[PDB]
Amino acid sequence: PYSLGPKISDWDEQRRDWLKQNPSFPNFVAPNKPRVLLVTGSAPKPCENPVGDHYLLKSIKNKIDYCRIHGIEIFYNMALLDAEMAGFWAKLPLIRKLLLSHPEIEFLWWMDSDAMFTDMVFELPWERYKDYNLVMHGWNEMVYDQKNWIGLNTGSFLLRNSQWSLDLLDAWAPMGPKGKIREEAGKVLTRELKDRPAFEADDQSAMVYLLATEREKWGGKVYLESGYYLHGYWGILVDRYEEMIENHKPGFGDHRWPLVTHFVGCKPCGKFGDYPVERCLRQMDRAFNFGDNQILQMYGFTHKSLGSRRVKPTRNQTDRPLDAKDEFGLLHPPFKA
Amino acid sequence: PYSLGPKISDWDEQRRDWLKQNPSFPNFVAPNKPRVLLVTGSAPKPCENPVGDHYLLKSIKNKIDYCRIHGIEIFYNMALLDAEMAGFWAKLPLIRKLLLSHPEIEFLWWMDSDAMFTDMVFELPWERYKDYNLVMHGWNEMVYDQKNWIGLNTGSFLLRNSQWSLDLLDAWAPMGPKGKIREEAGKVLTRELKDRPAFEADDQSAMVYLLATEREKWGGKVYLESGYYLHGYWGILVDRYEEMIENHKPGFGDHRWPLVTHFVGCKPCGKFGDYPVERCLRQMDRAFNFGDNQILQMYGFTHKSLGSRRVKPTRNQTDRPLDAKDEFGLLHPPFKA
Ligand SMILES: [Mn+2]
Ligand SMILES: [Mn+2]
């Protein structure tokens, strides 16, 4: 029987004792501000589609920028820790290892390489989640009533460092082991979930199924967020960027200015995507520049357009660089004070 | 004539005033630990040789890991701010912009994309530099006496946020403007510097020439460091990794375990390069794994060999993960306390 690791039952007590013995490493860097580790990753080998690595590079630059502004540490994984949990299941062993190795982290933010930050101002509403252990974008009706395989998203989620979360990982992993287990679990998921195509079990479908069938055990500590785009499906966002620039401003996080643009269905690095690679790549460039404009503007620059790598000044140089203060206070924000 | 920007003459007073008004952003994060921003970058377009982008991705992962452990923020530039200062000269306008935009940073650490951290334990000896404004790997005799074009290295250096440094940037830039200026400067540099081949002016040669011709003006505040490999030439280091693993341990930073392995002359993003690309990529793989083993060790894994992307456990999983303080104290080091 597959196991993520030796059973731990007293992790909340272990963390409590460790935190008391190591006050230099508090789990809350401030009142309503948990210590957060953002975790992402990609394969240790070059992309099968070679230009895909350039897009991975732009993706990590984008996350570096958001995390620098917001005081979040980053871990970038390139190692397969468990051959049975390859592919999109690889995040489970990695997450468990990081939680157990970093008792000082309160929340782990898993974020796919193909999920891009497009609101550099918006800060997660941490106080909203003080009584919750897992936060995912999604809708209660789609998950619990319809059992829709896209009723939630596992490409951008928050998981609290807690015994509950270790237990959740154990309950989530069973459909993952490569081979007959994952193949047959995929048949179950396609039969039981709404709108799922035929393919081996994936972690997102497995989470929908877990929550829909075991709601009494898990649902009370799960927050399905639909107020802002913790995950934002690219197809309904990327063509609207210029309208957002004209009508809105960074900071909204929702349809007015999405926190995350996530390129589900695109395969820039592998093969067999649902959308043409050329369309995906050009929209990924637009999303990158949409986010990057918010970084460059702190420094007096902007992209000439969302489709151009070239930048231009937004203002003249000055011999009093400290008299202004950037429009959105991202050079010296309270998240880093 | 070319100018990096309008003349500022009172930057030290401006920073002093800003720091007093913004005590939430001190320029020293600990008694003798300056606030440091590590700056790197790469050209905005995809590599002409697509696999080059994979190596840029491995490079930034490596820097993320070192900087997470050592409490250093990262800025990754992909924008050309000045068309005249193309190529490696592009770091001058970038550095100036970042210094003037981040008064809270005390040192900017410029590090090339082809420079990799290979000692994850070693911390820079900041107190050694308390009376200096520019720290580069090199030798006084090679720069000031021999005027050798490789007597110092500008691919990994520390520059203090100060008026002196603004003035240094102004004095360093004049040979940079692309075209006739850079071409004619290259003829002067090849004539005046020892061992320099014939090519247009580069920023490293221009720094040797500045210091050798204007030592009274600049030399007092420059620290040419040779006690550890703030820069380390890959061609003499990479073959010795096995010997280092057998005989030494991380933390020395020098010939026993180099802080930086720098792949000067390797150009995996372009078509040429001074050295055969095959050895370049194989040795970049080894340097990445040499550094990555120090990260993975914390988590109970190691690369199967220095040439392999695969990893293996170094120990069994446990239900008491917090009793093991990792060998080199990198999970909870004092740099992040
Ligand atoms: Mn995804
Ligand atoms: Mn270099």
Curated annotation (Swiss-Prot), chains A, B:
Q: Kindly list the positions annotated as binding UDP-alpha-D-xylose.
A: G41, D112, S113, D114, H262, G265, K267
Q: How does it assemble?
A: Forms homodimer. Interacts with XXT2.
Q: What is the effect of changing D112A?
A: Reduces activity 3-fold
Organism whose genome encodes this protein = Arabidopsis thaliana
Task: Output the lineage of the source organism.
Answer: Eukaryota, Viridiplantae, Streptophyta, Embryophyta, Tracheophyta
Known cofactor(s): Mn(2+)
Tell me the function of this protein: Xylosyltransferase specific to UDP-D-xylose that accepts both cellopentaose and cellohexaose as substrates, with a better use of cellohexaose, to produce xyloglucan. Adds preferentially the first xylosyl residue to the fourth glucosyl residue from the reducing end of both acceptors. Transfer one xylose mainly to the second glucose residue from the non-reducing end. The acceptor should have a minimum of four glucose residues.
Query: Where does this polypeptide localize?
Result: Golgi apparatus membrane
GO biological-process terms attached to the record:
polysaccharide biosynthetic process; protein glycosylation; xyloglucan metabolic process
* Binding of substrate, residues: H231, K267, D274, Y275
Top EC class, one word: transferase
Q: Show the GO MF annotations.
A: metal ion binding; UDP-xylosyltransferase activity; xyloglucan 6-xylosyltransferase activity
Q: Which residues are glycosylated?
A: N316
A single cellular component GO annotation: Golgi apparatus
Q: Which residues of the full protein are shown?
A: 116 to 452 of 460
Q: Write down the membrane topology.
A: Single-pass type II membrane protein
Query: This protein is called what?
Result: Xyloglucan 6-xylosyltransferase 1
Q: Catalyses which reaction?
A: Transfers an alpha-D-xylosyl residue from UDP-D-xylose to a glucose residue in xyloglucan, forming an alpha-(1->6)-D-xylosyl-D-glucose linkage
